[PDB]
């Protein structure tokens, strides 16, 4: 290293002294590199106790001991035995102070991080694991996730580093709920880390899927961030990656791709068809290149997917699995609609004594019959009477999709009962006000479910009225959206007060998803849910695009 460096400095450093002390707030490394490389050569020579300790600094003597504007911190510590003064004086994690009450906003990249990259490798990486090894007893003291996640060159040079980090965090699923560290980086990885290498994103998808499978998540009912991250991951690679990536996930559907999230799989395979559509990956062959995706189809078809049954089959340029589409038995042979309606009525009747047996009634709850019982409630002026609300908020959100499966058709029937408008206004004034209390469903599965079993030949032209009037009505939060839009484009990566900004924001309108709104005879809140909450409605910001596509492009027929 010294030969070429000296040969180049003999021609570049043609001067008489060491001028230009170069305070240089914005750009100081460009001028101080000549002295930093010299100090590194000095340390390398002193390590061997030879080479005259790299002599001849006279042309740079003024910049030599320049150590004695926060941007003047020339980090010349990479050699050895200097990682205390420059690095230690930096704005590290919070230790003094302690809920989103964390002080000390983070650092900007172009200010200091433009140079201190090859020096900061395993400082924060070991700091976080040391904080996480024992337990996250108190609320998370640091908020350095902004700086850590907004490190693109970090993952450019050490993409395997975050993989190792996640693998070492994996044992925490036994430590404590895998909560204090999973909800730490998973959010900002989806929101701040937009552009990343895909050959690792597929592995991260597999890890997310086996995470959603194992371990349990009944206490992690706020795991909607997991599904949002999965959607962001499977919705961004649709350009050209799946075809070269097939060799990576050849066995992934054969082992783990179909655990519970069938709607996630539906969106995944929709994006897969969209990707095979770019560009013309099927006009050439029909069965030769068929096996490229037929394996995935055969693995998925064990879980009644692609329920569209010739109505929504429009995005596939050559619909192959649509040949075996009759295997979906939508709405259970078109007769079980009224039968499950009568069953819901009988369950609403047996609610008179389901209280003492609610523990033995919630066990799998007859999956697509239980949680729709809330519908009869709020039709009798808050007829819930907190009999099993705490029990209702336990495991119901998983089977709520199977519950609303036939209830989409039942609500289409309630809507068509108008036949002129006599029931229309009653439905508008009752249903829209009763659905809001209380849920966080946020149409996360109704858009997919509408094409599953309601858009079929039963009332297709009438179930298409759903998107016309069912979810067109929600307008409760559009008032604060107009002010929430001006936070990320005005500050792409110019954030200096994002912590308190989003803290006040989520302190104003929202409270939580576990929390209730009615204070009835007894309500023990028991809040533990404060791991990290930087983003709340950017999750639906993406799923708005599948809605935008099922409403126009996918359902282009009507």
């Amino acid at each position: 290293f010294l030969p070429v460096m000296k040969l180049f400095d003999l021609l570049y450093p043609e001067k008489e002294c060491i001028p230009v002390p170069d305070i240089n707030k914005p750009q100081s490394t460009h001028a101080f590199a000549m002295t930093c490389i010299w100090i590194h050569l000095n340390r390398k020579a002193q390590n061997g106790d030879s080479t005259l300790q790299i002599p001849i600094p006279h042309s740079l003597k003024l910049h030599h001991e320049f150590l004695q504007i926060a941007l003047l911190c020339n980090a010349y510590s990479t050699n050895s035995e200097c990682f205390t003064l420059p690095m230690g004086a930096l704005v590290e994690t919070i230790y003094g102070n302690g809920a989103s009450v964390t002080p000390l906003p983070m650092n900007l990249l172009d200010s200091l991080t433009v140079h201190a990259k090859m020096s900061l490798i395993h400082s924060i990486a070991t700091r976080v694991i040391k904080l996480a090894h024992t337990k996250s007893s108190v609320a998370l003291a640091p908020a350095l996730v902004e700086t850590y996640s907004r490190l693109l060159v970090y993952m450019e040079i050490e993409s395997l580093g975050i993989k190792g980090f996640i693998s070492q965090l994996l044992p925490t699923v036994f430590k404590s709920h895998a909560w204090g560290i999973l909800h730490t980086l998973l959010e900002m990885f989806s929101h701040r880390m937009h552009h990343i290498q895909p050959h690792y994103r597929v592995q991260l998808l597999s890890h997310l899927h086996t995470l959603a499978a194992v371990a349990q998540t009944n206490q992690n009912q706020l795991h909607l961030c997991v599904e949002s991250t999965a959607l962001r991951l499977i919705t961004a690679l649709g350009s050209s990656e799946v075809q070269p990536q097939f060799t990576r996930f050849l066995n992934d559907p054969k082992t783990v791709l179909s655990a519970e999230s069938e709607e996630l799989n539906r969106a995944l395979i929709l994006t897969l068809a969209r990707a095979t559509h770019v560009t013309d990956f099927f006009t050439g062959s029909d069965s030769i290149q068929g096996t490229w995706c037929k394996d995935i189809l055969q693995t998925i078809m064990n879980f009644t997917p692609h329920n569209w049954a010739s109505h929504t089959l429009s995005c596939f340029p050559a619909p192959l699995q649509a040949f075996f589409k009759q295997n979906n038995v939508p709405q259970e042979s078109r007769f079980n609609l009224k039968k499950n309606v009568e069953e819901e009525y009988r369950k609403w009747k047996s609610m008179t004594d389901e209280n003492e047996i609610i523990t033995q009634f919630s066990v799998q709850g007859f999956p697509p019959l239980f949680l729709c019982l809330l519908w009869k409630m709020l039709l009798e002026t808050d007829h819930i009477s907190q009999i099993g609300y705490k029990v209702l908020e336990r495991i119901g959100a998983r089977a709520l999709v199977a519950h609303v499966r036939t209830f989409a058709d039942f609500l289409v029937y309630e809507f068509s009962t108008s036949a002129g408008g006599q029931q229309l206004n009653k439905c508008i004034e009752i249903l829209n006000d009763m659905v809001w209390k209380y849920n966080i469903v946020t149409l996360d599965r109704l858009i997919l479910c509408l094409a599953m079993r309601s858009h079929e030949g039963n009332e297709a032209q009438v179930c298409y009225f759903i998107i016309q009037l069912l979810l067109l009505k929600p307008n409760d939060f559009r008032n604060r959206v107009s002010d929430f839009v001006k936070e990320n484009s005005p500050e792409h990566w110019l954030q200096s007060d994002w912590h308190t900004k989003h803290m006040s924001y989520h302190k104003k309108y929202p409270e939580k998803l576990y929390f209730e709104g009615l204070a009835e005879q007894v309500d023990p809140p028991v809040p533990i849910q404060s791991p990290y909450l930087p983003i709340y409605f950017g999750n639906v910001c993406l799923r708005f695009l599948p809605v935008f596509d099922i409403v126009i492009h996918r359902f282009l027929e009507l």
């Binding site: 005259l52 790299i54 002599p55 001849i56």
Partner: protein
């Protein structure tokens, strides 16, 4: 600050005896003014040093001066020290006049005092009757010696071979303290 200027004159008188003196006096050449011979660059740090070489008057129809060492970067010095060729009045006076001029230019350029030294190594005990007749200066051996002793406080060391001719007794005429006499057989000294 290690501002030296060598003066090689025994290139033609005693060729093979050059290595015998080098193997013993190479340490004061580098190991004293530096850490040791390495692969490094040079600058205005003042550590630079020169080396003038001369030959006898018989093998010199036109070529007399070959003082070629501006800086030498503390390593190329010993590099070309073994590269010079090896070819009675050996014209020591005109050979020292150019060293005096080189020291004058040093003092004129080194303004912002480095304990200068010089080795008038001469194998034979020669003597140059004509003063210079080849440069700007014009002064006999005695005049040049008293000028180099009085003006410059340089340690006028005379590293001659193991011989002890009458040259030392006359060339020790440095009146200020310059250590012109020593012909060091024992272990190397700093500058004397």
């Amino acid at each position: 600050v290690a501002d030296v200027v060598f003066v090689i004159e025994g290139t033609a008188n005693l060729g093979p005896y050059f290595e015998e003196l080098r193997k013993h006096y190479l340490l004061p050449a580098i190991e004293y003014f530096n850490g040791g011979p390495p692969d490094f660059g040079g600058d205005y740090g003042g550590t630079q040093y020169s080396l003038v070489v001369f030959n006898t008057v018989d093998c010199a129809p036109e070529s007399y001066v070959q003082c070629h060492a501006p800086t030498s970067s503390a390593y190329e010095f010993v590099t070309w020290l073994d590269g010079i060729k090896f070819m009675s009045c050996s014209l020591i006076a005109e050979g020292l006049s150019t060293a005096l001029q080189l020291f004058d230019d040093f003092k004129k350029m080194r303004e912002q005092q480095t304990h200068r030294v010089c080795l008038l190594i001469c194998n034979s005990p020669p003597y140059l009757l004509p003063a210079v007749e080849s440069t700007t200066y014009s002064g006999c051996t005695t005049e040049s010696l008293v000028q180099k002793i009085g003006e410059r406080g340089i340690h006028f060391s005379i590293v001659s071979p193991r011989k002890l001719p009458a040259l030392r007794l006359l060339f020790e005429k440095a009146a200020p303290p310059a250590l012109l006499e020593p012909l060091q057989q024992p272990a190397d000294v700093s500058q004397d």
